[PDB]
Every structure is written in structure tokens, then in C-alpha cells.
Design a protein around this nucleic acid. Sequence first.
RNA 1: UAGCUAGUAGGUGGGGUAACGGCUCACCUAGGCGACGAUCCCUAGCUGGUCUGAGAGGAUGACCAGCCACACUGGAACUGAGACACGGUCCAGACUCCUACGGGAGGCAGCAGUGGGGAAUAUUGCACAAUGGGCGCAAGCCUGAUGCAGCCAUGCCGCGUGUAUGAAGAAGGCCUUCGGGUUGUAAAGUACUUUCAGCGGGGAGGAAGGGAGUAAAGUUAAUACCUUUGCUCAUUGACGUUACCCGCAGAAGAAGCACCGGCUAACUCCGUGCCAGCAGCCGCGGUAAUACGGAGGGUGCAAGCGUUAAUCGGAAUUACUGGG
Lengths: 85, 82, 132, 123, 262, 205
Amino acid sequence: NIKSAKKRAIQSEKARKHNASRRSMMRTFIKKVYAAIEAGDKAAAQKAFNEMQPIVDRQAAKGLIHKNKAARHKANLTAQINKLA
Amino acid sequence: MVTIRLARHGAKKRPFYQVVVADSRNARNGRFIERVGFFNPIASEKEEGTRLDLDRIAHWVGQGATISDRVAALIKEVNKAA
Amino acid sequence: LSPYLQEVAKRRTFAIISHPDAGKTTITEKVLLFGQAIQTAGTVKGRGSNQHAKSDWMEMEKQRGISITTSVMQFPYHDCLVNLLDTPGHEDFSEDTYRTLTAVDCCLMVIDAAKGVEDRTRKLMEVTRLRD
Amino acid sequence: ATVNQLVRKPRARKVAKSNVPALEACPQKRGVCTRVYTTTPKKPNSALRKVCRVRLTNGFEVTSYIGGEGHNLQEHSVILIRGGRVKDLPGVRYHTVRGALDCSGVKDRKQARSKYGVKRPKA
Amino acid sequence: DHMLDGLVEWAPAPMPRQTDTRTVEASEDKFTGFVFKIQANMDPKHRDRVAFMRVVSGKYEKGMKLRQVRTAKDVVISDALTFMAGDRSHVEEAYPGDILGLHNHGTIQIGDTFTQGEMMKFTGIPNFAPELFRRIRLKDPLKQKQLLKGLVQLSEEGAVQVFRPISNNDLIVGAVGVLQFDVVVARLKSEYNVEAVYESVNVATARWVECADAKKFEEFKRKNESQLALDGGDNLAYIATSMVNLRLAQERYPDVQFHQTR
Amino acid sequence: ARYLGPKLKLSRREGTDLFLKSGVRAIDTKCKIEQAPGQHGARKPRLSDYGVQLREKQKVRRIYGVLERQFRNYYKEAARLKGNTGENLLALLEGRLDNVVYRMGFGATRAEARQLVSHKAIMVNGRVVNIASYQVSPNDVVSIREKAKKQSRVKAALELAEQREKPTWLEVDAGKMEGTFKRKPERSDLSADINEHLIVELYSK
RNA sequence: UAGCUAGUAGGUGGGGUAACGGCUCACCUAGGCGACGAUCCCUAGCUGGUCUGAGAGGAUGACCAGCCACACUGGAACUGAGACACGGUCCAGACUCCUACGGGAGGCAGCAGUGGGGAAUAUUGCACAAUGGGCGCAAGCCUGAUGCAGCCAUGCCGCGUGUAUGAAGAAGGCCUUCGGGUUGUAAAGUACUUUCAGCGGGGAGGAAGGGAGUAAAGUUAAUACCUUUGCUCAUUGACGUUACCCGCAGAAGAAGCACCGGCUAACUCCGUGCCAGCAGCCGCGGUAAUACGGAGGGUGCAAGCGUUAAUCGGAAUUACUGGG
Ligand SMILES: Nc1nc2c(ncn2[C@@H]2O[C@H](COP(=O)(O)OP(=O)(O)CP(=O)(O)O)[C@@H](O)[C@H]2O)c(=O)[nH]1
């Protein structure tokens, strides 16, 4: 529809790549740790967890993650990596 | 955001405001938490012109209710030393 | 020398009247080219020029007839902006033009040679002599 | 009595049907109104009751009684149909409204002129 | 192609036009745009009346508030159509000496004057007296309301003035010309679906419109209560079947504040 | 709203004097009372229960000048009051302003009192009242404003006030036309003839 | 409508939601609902409430208000605390419009308004003057919510359309036993008054605020800036030719609708003649009609009156109160 407030459409287009791409790279790091769960190497699992922890806390800080999803990821992933170790 | 505001009741060409605590997203005649006092702008000098209970108003100030201009003028009408 | 009156002077009126079967519609449609061309002339200079398809031969063929009422063309013409005002030309018709030749300052006559000066033209001149 | 049967099966109120099937409780209807003829009534009457088979605009085929003295109907002239039985014709449960559409009012009436569509005598 | 240079060079400024006081020039204010035609409109979904105007004096404003002089009311009109290349274009203001089109709904007749306070009238309306052709008899008599509105919609125009008799049938189409094929073709539109094919019925002479002053036309209504007829715009002329009845009407002496409406 | 018609035909119709033709003159005997209400008034009716109920209702109404919907509103107001409905209904009928103006003697008949109320002349408590259905509160004072005082129409009609019973529940000054309203009237004081019980019967069914 | 269910019922583990959750996947068992109505069909937004009814109940829930659902149809996601979105996005379908035919635009179940439907429902009006919402420190901006204005007797309420006097008991109509009665204090005449309309002048209240200037107290190094309170000035109204008040003139402009055999309030005459016709039921009209039509008169209601349509009561003729 013809409206002066169409700026929030294309700016959300400006959102739907970039922030989501951050979410994209976020979950790939998470999936990397699942590769360690399929690897059996507890040292590589600890290294991958230490690699994914500050970026998922930064994504919880920037309003994309509501700091309870990422807390659930840290909780169950810590439970997996110390059940394996 | 809760606020204390008038509700505009009455009849046609006969206003009768209801100072009331309500959320800002609600309507004027819509949902409210509780009512406290009233105001009648066409109330000439007679037995009663304005009732206003300041205790619940102070309780909502202690909770964070934003006071509008007309309600603040009614507070300055019901003065502590006058 | 205010531009308000200078473009009051750029607004003119053509009454437009004639005999039945004289050619009001064709001359107005060609002043649209004419006016449309004036639009094209106005649209002639710019970064790009856009004109409606010059109508194609297959659809060029089609037609309508018998006139009636009137139409108004303001125009975008280059020099001035001179309005038109059509009217149905008959004896049973044209009660529009008895009150809209009062609207229009000037007068255009269209007379055919096969028709000549007839009672339609005498009635229109009886109208136009009252206001000069 | 026997209230345990009322516990099993609840007490049902009889739903009486309407005397006029007028498509969800309307006051008046408008129809095509064909077939204008006179009808011999039931036993104690012996009259010529002017009636019309009105094809209504909702699909129902009702037959309304033509009241008054004189009318201008011939297979046409869409009119208004009101409810109310006649107790004179088996199957006729409607009346025709005068002062309504193409059927004009009754000529030269003075009394009871709210019914039959007659205006006030202007002379 | 050679006409355009003559149109530029020969035609003068738009002349002043006569009012009851004096001629109003093309440099003043108080927009003199009175309505000329109420034209037989093509109807996409709406009517709009049409408002051809004499806005020769005064440059437009977008939020201007006109004044209906004959009803003396301040009417706010912000929508004004310009006839750019025949198509009714957007909301646009212009330079004076142009002809608009506005949006009316049964309010403004032919020649209703407009100013911003000059409560005077022009010297127009050269419209004539009709010649009464036949009838409306409602073939396919379903849905009368398209002719009870839509031809009464056409009754405000200078060509058509619909006459309603009391008997609620046989409505007379007013023609000042002869060819009523215009209305017959206009009966095939989006809000026009009734045919009404013509025949020969004799109603003679033009129905001279007259509305007398109070306390005196009441008995004139009462003595011939079967001889009245409503008009387009709630008028009552007399009824015109012959010249002898008009002579009896002149013998009856209806003293009147006379307005022709034609 | 108002009847404005044959006000003396109603007195023949009910048989009793409804005081619609009270006037300056006394009891007229100019209409052949009790023996000719109309064209066929020589007939003796069956006069059933609903008949005497309707005659009593229309008798009290054409005494007090109240229409049917308005009197039904008065009955609905009297039904929710304390005591009994029959005394309360006649108290509400007496509480009309035009009835008070009639009892003061400010006008010969009741329609004259209604016209005197309606034409901005009757003023109670310093506030002018035009509606004749004004519910008169106890302890009020009624008078006539100075611009409409004694243009003779109150004057000779006040002489009729010297011939009436002059009841207890209201006092007139008769020197400056300033009346004084008092406590509500008892049932055994107002006219001693009308029957409220038939009205209760008619409005109870 | 007597069987329904296979992500179905439960558990373990992984993933997912702001959060429990077969919410979603891998494995194991056969459970789960059901005659105190499971599954299927039709209908329906729900409620506070409305109408009726002594009460219990019955229909309804349109306007006021709370919740839910929807935005031409269906599906899907992003933004954000909150949408899986009326005036945001995309795709698929239908219907219109433009095109220079390569491609795009649209969604009034918003306010207005139009076509169609139907017995039936409004103006393409004024303004943020007041409230409320959004943004801004504030001034200011938007607000078809709202405050109103216009139309509709749609419902309720009030007022008026005169009052007092006035017999020759006039004229005309109706009846008659042609004596007379009725219409009828009705009308004419006389004396007053003018509610409401018409016109001419004053004129509140809905108006709190906000702006400029000054003084005092806080703040601070600061008599500078900023907050707050008195105080001085110019002020902010669409309604609005406002409510209301005064004056001018003249009873002057303002009364109709149903019924009259019983139910149920009210009587005759004339015209047909089981015909025209009326009727809610009993039913009348067959040449002396209190039942049709007309006239007179009366009754009832009143700017409304009758008819039609729907709910309740009467109907204890759905009996739980309260039947056999
Ligand atoms: N060859 C030719 N034919 C012409 C010319 N002008 C008009 N015509 C023809 O004459 C006829 C007039 O048509 P039209 O334009 O409708 O006439 P009109 O003046 O509008 C009719 P009315 O006066 O009623 O409004 C048509 O058949 C048209 O083709 C011309 O210059 N050349």
C-alpha cells in the first residue's frame, strides 16, 4: 500500500540478512560442538565450547537471544561435555 | 505504562469526567484498574463540586503512575495547605 | 508586472459551435495531437521521452458516432493554456450551448460548403450577437 | 413425577412453528405476484375471493389474499405482501398491502383509511 | 496546425461578466464560479453531479471554503477535478480562467452563484420551456428504485425534468428537445436497467411551473386534489393538458413570488 | 397533548361535575346534565366492572388533565413509594404545579392555570417553571412575576377563590399573589368523591 | 451419530519455545476416550447484561464494557518486549485498472459515499476547542477515536396547537312518534394572554492549560542556566445565527389515527343483498345489517395512531416450585 511509513519494511530487509547471518554463524559454532559430540574428543569439545561461549553470550547481549535460550545451550552442552569427559 | 487520567463520561453537552487509573494502551472508556474520585467541570458552587481521595493517588505515585495535566491541576486544586 | 495577471492573460476560452455533421469531434481530437503533441512537445525535452503507442493498424480501424453532450480539454500547450468546451450540435440538442456560450469569451465557427449557412448557423449567430 | 427420568432425559419445551414461513421473522415481503383469479371459499361463505399466487423474491411460492374493492393487477405489477391468515381460504395465510407498490389504493374510501392505503380526503 | 498561432495572437484576456451590481473584472477576488451544466454523467461507481465553473476571477486555493449564495452557507470544498486531456485528473489547483469539476450530491442546480460575501446574482440561465413527451411505464417492473432515483437524478439537468403525478404510475419524462433517445441509451448503465419503450400518449404544453405565496395556495391545492403533479425538485406546476386549463388557472389568480426554475 | 375541545361534554359523559367549566359563573344548568351525554344518551348501559373502572379512570384523568402514558408513569412512580399506592397516586396528582395554581385561585379553570404556568408567569422559589407537570416539593412558595402580575385575569378569577372550600394544605396571601405550599394532603381532604381503588384495579391487571 | 484414536496414550533420551509441554524427532509398551454421550452432522462468537416473569424459569446478548477470532481466500516467515500482523512483506488463486504490453497497482468486515440484496437503516460535514493515544525537554504536528453538526417521530420524555365569558339554546348535517332531540359553549361575538415557531438585541458554561515578563525558594563557584510556586499582560470554542434572558406583532403558523355484536371502551340511519365485503376467536352479510360501504354521533390514544414480524406472561397447555 502507498504509505509514507514504508521505511520500516526495507530497513527490516536490512535486518533480515545481517542479524540473521549472525544467528547463522552462531548456530554453526553450536553445530561444531555437536561435531565434537560425534567425535569423542573431550579436549576438542572443551576448546569448541570455549570458542562458542563468548559469541553466544554476545548474541544474548545484543537482543537477538533472550538470555535463556543461550543459557539452555550452555547448560545442556556443558552437561554433555562433562558427561563425555 | 499506567497513568491517572480523565475518562469523559456524562451526557451529550453534559460532561462528567472520571479521574481513574488505567493503562495507556487501554481506551478512554475502556478497561481500568480502579476508580478514585471524580470531577465535574460544569459543577457550579453547590453542596459538592469535586471529590478526590489523595491516599490512593499517593499510592499510585509510589508505584510510578504518570500524572496528566488535568489531574495535576486537580491536585493543585485540592491543596495540602488550602 | 506580477506573474498572477501575466498568466491570467495566458488563459483563454474557445466557445466551439457549428452545424450538425460539421466536424467538432475530429478537430478536437486533432488539437489533442495536437494537445497531446503539445504534451509531447512539453514532454519532447527531458532525459527521456514517453508517448502512447501511435495506434497500430489492426486497432486503428475502429469507430463511434452521433456526438452529444460536451467535453472539456484544459491542455498543457506550450505558449498559453486555452480551454475547450464541447457541446452537442443539433436543434433538439444544444441547450447546453445557450448557457455555455455565455461562459466562453470567444467563438469558433465550423461551416461546411455542402451545408453552407443554414438555420443552425442563424440561430448560433442570434446567440452570439447578444454578447458581441 | 419420576424425577430420575428428568435427570436422564431433560424436560423439553415444545417448539411451535410460525404461522407464516417468512424467512427468519420479517414483517413484510415483496414478490412477483402472478396468477390473479377468484376462489370459492370454504363451507359457510360462498364468495368470489380475489387471490394471487405470489412468487416471492426469496424463492417461496405463497398465495396472498387481495383485499379491497377493485384492483389493477394482470400477471405483473410487483406489490408488497404482509402476514396474517384469512380463515376463509385453505392455503392462504397472507394479505396484500395497499398504499404500497404498483397496486394503487382503493378508490373513494373515507373510514378506516390507515388500512387499504387511502390518503386523507384533500377536498 | 495554423489555428494555434491565431488562438495565441487574436484572442484577448477573458472579459468581465455582468452581475446585478456591475461587471467583475479578472483581477479581483471572491471566486465567481457558478455552475453551468449538471451534465448527463458517465457513471463508473459514483455520480458527483459535475461543476463547470466561471473561475475567471481569482487564483485557486487547495483548502478554500466556498459560499453558497442562494442558500447562504459556508461550504468547505477541498476536492476539485481538473480536466487534463479529458480524463478527470487528480486534486489540483490552477490559474484563473479555468473550468473545474466538483463533487455534488443533489445540492446545486444550474446557475447557483458563488462569492466570498458578495451576495448578488448574475444575468444567466437562458434555459427554455419543455415540450412534454410521453411517459415511464416500467417494463420488467422489478426494482423501481433505479428509476425513482436515477431519472430523478437526471431531473436536475436542463434537458430532463421528471414530472411525478399523484397516481404513482405514468411518470412523465421532461424533454425540451424532441429526441428522447438520449435517456433511453442512458437507461443501460451500471445503475440503470429498465427499458421503457415508447408509444404515443398526449400531454400537451410544458407544465408552467408556479409556486404561490402562503395562506393562498392551500385552497388552490384543495379544490382540484386530483389535478396536481409533483416535479423534479418538489414543485407543482399546475397540470398541463390543454390551453383552456391554463386560461382557467389564470382566471383563478395565483398571486406568486415567481421563479421560473427553467 | 391538550384536549382543547368540548370540556363540558365530558362532565355530561361522566355525569358528575368535572370542574372543567368552573369559571366566574356558578353551576350553569345550561347543558342538560346527567340526561344527555350525547346523541343516544337516553340509553341505560349494562355498566360492567371494566366499564366502571374505565369511567372512573377517565373521570379522574379529565379532572386532572393527565394523558394516559403520563398517568401510567404516575402510577409507576406511586407503586414504588411507601404506604399505599392509592393515597400516593392522588398525592402525585395534587403535586402538579398547575393543580397548585388552580387551588390557589390563580385562574378560573384548570386550563387557565396551565396556560398561566406555561406563559412564564408562575414562579416557584424564584425560578420560573413552564411545565405544568412540575412536581411541587414540600415547603415551597409560589407567586407571579412583576411583569405578569395582575393584568386582571388573575383578579376576577381570584373572586372564585372566595367561593371555593380553600383547603388546609396551602395558603394564599391574596395581597401580593404569593402562595405558600405546605405538607402533603390527606386522602380524606381532597374532594371526598373520587375512587382510587378502581384505578388500582385497572392498572393492576 | 456407538464405537473413536496410530504422534494416538505413557515413559527414556536429543532438539525447540521468554517457559512446562508428543511442541518436535530416535527407542520401548499398548495404552487413551466413552452411555455421568467418546467420534460424526447442523447451528452459534462468549459474558457482564436486555426483555418478560411474584419467584423459579424462557428467549436474547443490538447499542455500553471485558475477552476471543478475522482483515478478498489460503499458507509462510522477518522486525520487536509484545504481530506469526486492517491501512507491513512474499507466494498461490479469483476479480478489476494501466501499459510504450517488457511488467506492475489494488484490497472500505475504517469514517463518509456507490452498485446489488432487502420491508428496512444516514452526510463523500466542522475541529483537535476538551479528553485520550503516538513523537518531541518543551513549544508545536497527526488523530473519520472523540467533541459535535445534518437526516430519520426509530424509542422515551415534555410543551403547544388557546383561555374566560358567550343562547337565538343561530346556520348546516343526522335521527324522529316530525312534539323535538343531537352535533352544541361547539361555532359566531366580546375580553385577555402568547409557551413553542418568525424577527431584532444581550449572553454564560463546557477552559484546564500553554506563551512572554517579574519576585521568592532549591541547584551550583555562580545573583548565569534549569525545576517548582505566587504574581502582571496578551490570550486559546467546531458546536455557535449556542443554552438562557429581554423586546416587536398578531389566536395569529401548528391534530390527527384506530374502533363501535361479545371478548373490550362506544349507537342509529341510508345503499346493496351469502354479492360487494370484514374478521385476532366465536363468526355476520340469503331485501328491516348495533359485524360490509357511506353519513351522523361516540369511544380510546395523542404527534402519534392502527396493521404486520419476534420474545415472555396469561400457559400449572412441558408441571423442579407446579400435571397425570
Ligand atoms: N474527409 C473529411 N471528413 C471530415 C472532415 N471533417 C469532418 N469529416 C467527416 O464529417 C463527419 C462529421 O463527424 P463529427 O466530427 O462527429 O461531426 P460533429 O461536428 O462532431 C457533429 P455535431 O455538430 O453534432 O457535434 C464525419 O463523418 C467525419 O468523418 C474533414 O476534414 N475531412
